[PDB]
Amino acid sequence: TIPHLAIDPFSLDFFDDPYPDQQTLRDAGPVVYLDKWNVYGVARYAEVHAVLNDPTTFCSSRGVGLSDFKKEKPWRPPSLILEADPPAHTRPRAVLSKVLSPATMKTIRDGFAAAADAKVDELLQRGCIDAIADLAEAYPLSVFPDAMGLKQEGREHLLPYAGLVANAFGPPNELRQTAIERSAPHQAYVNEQCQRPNLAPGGFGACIHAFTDTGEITPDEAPLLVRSLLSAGLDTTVNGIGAAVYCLARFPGELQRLRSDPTLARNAFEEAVRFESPVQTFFRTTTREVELGGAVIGEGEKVLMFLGSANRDPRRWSDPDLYDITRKTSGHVGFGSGVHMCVGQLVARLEGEVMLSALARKVAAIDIDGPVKRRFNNTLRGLESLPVKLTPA
Ligand code: HEM
Ligand SMILES: COc1ccc(C(=O)O)cc1
Numbered sequence: 001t002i003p004h005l006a007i008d009p010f011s012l013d014f015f016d017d018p019y020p021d022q023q024t025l026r027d028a029g030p031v032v033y034l035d036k037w038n039v040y041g042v043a044r045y046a047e048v049h050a051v052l053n054d055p056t057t058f059c060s061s062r063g064v065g066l067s068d069f070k071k072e073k074p075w076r077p078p079s080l081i082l083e084a085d086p087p088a089h090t091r092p093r094a095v096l097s098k099v100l101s102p103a104t105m106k107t108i109r110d111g112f113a114a115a116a117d118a119k120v121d122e123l124l125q126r127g128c129i130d131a132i133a134d135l136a137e138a139y140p141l142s143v144f145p146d147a148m149g150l151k152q153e154g155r156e157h158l159l160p161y162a163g164l165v166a167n168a169f170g171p172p173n174e175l176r177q178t179a180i181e182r183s184a185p186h187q188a189y190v191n192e193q194c195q196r197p198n199l200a201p202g203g204f205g206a207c208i209h210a211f212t213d214t215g216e217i218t219p220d221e222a223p224l225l226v227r228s229l230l231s232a233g234l235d236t237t238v239n240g241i242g243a244a245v246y247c248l249a250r251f252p253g254e255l256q257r258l259r260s261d262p263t264l265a266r267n268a269f270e271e272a273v274r275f276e277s278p279v280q281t282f283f284r285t286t287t288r289e290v291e292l293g294g295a296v297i298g299e300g301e302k303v304l305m306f307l308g309s310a311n312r313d314p315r316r317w318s319d320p321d322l323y324d325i326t327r328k329t330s331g332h333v334g335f336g337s338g339v340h341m342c343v344g345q346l347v348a349r350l351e352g353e354v355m356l357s358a359l360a361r362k363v364a365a366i367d368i369d370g371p372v373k374r375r376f377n378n379t380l381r382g383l384e385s386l387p388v389k390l391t392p393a
Contacts, residue, residue: 001295003029003032004032004033004034005024005034006036007021007024007025007034007036008036009021009281010037015374015376015377016374018280019321022309025041026313029293030042030292030293031047031292031293031297037302039283039302039303039304040295040297040301040303041303041304042304042306043309043310044313044315044316045310045311045313045316046313046316047292047293048306048310048333049333050292051284052305052341053338055085055339055340056086057286057288058284058287059085059285059287060082060083060084060089060284061078061083061088063285064083064169065170065283066172068285068300068302070285070300075168079224079227079231080225080228081225081228082228082340089339091215091217094216095225096225096228096344098211099204099207099208100204100344100346104207105350108147109354111143112350113358115139116354116358117358119135120358120363123135124392127389128369128387128388129390131249131366132384132386135355136239136241136245136383137238139241139351140234140237140241140351141158141159144237144351145158148199148203148229148230149199149204150198150199150200150203151200157186157189157190158190158234161186161187161190162234162235163179163377164187165231165232166235166378167179167379169283175376175378190231191223193226193230194226195223196209196222205226208222208226233347236279237278237347238382239278239382240269240348241355242382243381243382243383244269244272244356245359245366246386247271249367249368249386250323251322252365252366254323254324255366257325257326258325258356258359258360264326264360265352265357265360267325268325269352269353270329271327273332273334273335273352274311274327274332274334275312278334278380278381278382279379279380280308280380281304281306282379283303284305286300286301307333310333311333311334316331361393362392362393363390364391364392366388366391368386368387369388371385371387372385372387373385
């Protein structure tokens with residue numbers, strides 16, 4: 001009843017061009033079995049959305065990577081939010097929600113926007129840049145570590161640690177084992193910066209520690225919650241901004257619409273998140289026998305959700321393979337859906353919005369003028385290098 005496929009969604013060939021294989025996965029049926037890794041897969045929007053929104057049946061506390069924490073030891077102490085289920089999830093989630101809240105965004109927006117404008121001004125003086133290193137990486141690194149309250153020294157560990165975390169959700173392939181082999185210095189830096197004395201007053205990390213006296217989290221839970229923001233708070237924003245620049249370079253008609261109405265900047269970034277989905281996949285583990293899309297899945301089975309595929313499912317989206325900055329993006333699953341839906345989404349959207357706004361107001365053309373190189377990661381999609389020429393408006 002369930003089609004079995006040999007597609008390896010964690011292979012370099014798949015990463016290099018995933019979209020034909022994602023169509024094969026969608027069109028094979030609502031639920032597939034991936035023989036390479038002995039997991040179930042769902043690649044259509046309907047089933048991905050259903051799985052995300054049933055956390056009791058499709059839990060997170062046995063890990064959201066391939067590994068089942070009931071069977072194997074986690075490679076680091078589990079996240080108190082990403083790898084927890086309700087009710088344990090609920091109060092740590094509330095703390096991070098308040099730390100990264102709508103009200104917090106007001107306190108950081110002016111500085112984030114000023115830094116985005118300053119970066120584009122700097123880049124226009126150079127003309128020919130690498131939109132990854134010099135823009136997609138450089139801009140988040142110029143605002144988010146400061147907003148965290150991190151010291152200056154050791155920040156070179158942040159992107160490597162995030163890539164390690166992302167690779168470690170994958171299967172035990174070469175990408176994962178090489179990441180773990182190289183992990184020790186990055187883990188040591190990150191774990192140390194999570195301690196309260198190392199986080200500057202008023203920043204995200206200090207605010208997490210300040211919540212330890214409300215009864216929502218204890219003092220010994222705050223370092224792991226800081227760790228969540230150091231794990232998740234940079235690499236997907238980098239990939240999303242790079243994806244947005246890539247899209248504006250490949251679809252010049254959309255850059256022209258953005259220039260003509262810069263208030264489209266927020267939705268142009270949201271559409272980039274749908275179109276390139278920086279987080280491609282997450283797993284759940286079944287806690288009982290369950291019927292999903294006409295399939296019976298036993299207890300204790302891993303279920304791989306294809307978020308990027310769900311965001312390009314023609315059953316849900318009109319012309320899913322077009323980048324359209326006025327698309328109604330509401331409902332895409334690039335940030336997840338339901339109780340675990342990205343708690344940092346307002347930070348990511350703020351950064352993406354103000355960077356695309358600066359581009360919309362200052363740049364007349366973005367032309368690729370060198371070889372584009374892909375960055376390979378078991379769970380993240382994004383570019384390694386994006387040589388562009390920026391023409392000033
Ligand atoms: C474009 C940028 C981003 C993308 C595409 C993205 C994607 C996602 C997705 C798909 C999830 C759902 C995980 C699941 O259902 O198992 C998630 C959760 C989460 N994200 Fe983001 N994320 C981004 C930016 C950020 C930022 C900037 C932060 C922190 C400042 C952050 C922190 C978190 C945390 C802590 C969780 C776990 C939430 C929970 O389990 O309740 N993310 N993200
Ligand atoms: C979206 O990716 C991540 C990665 C790590 C964590 C965490 O460490 O809590 C959360 C989300």
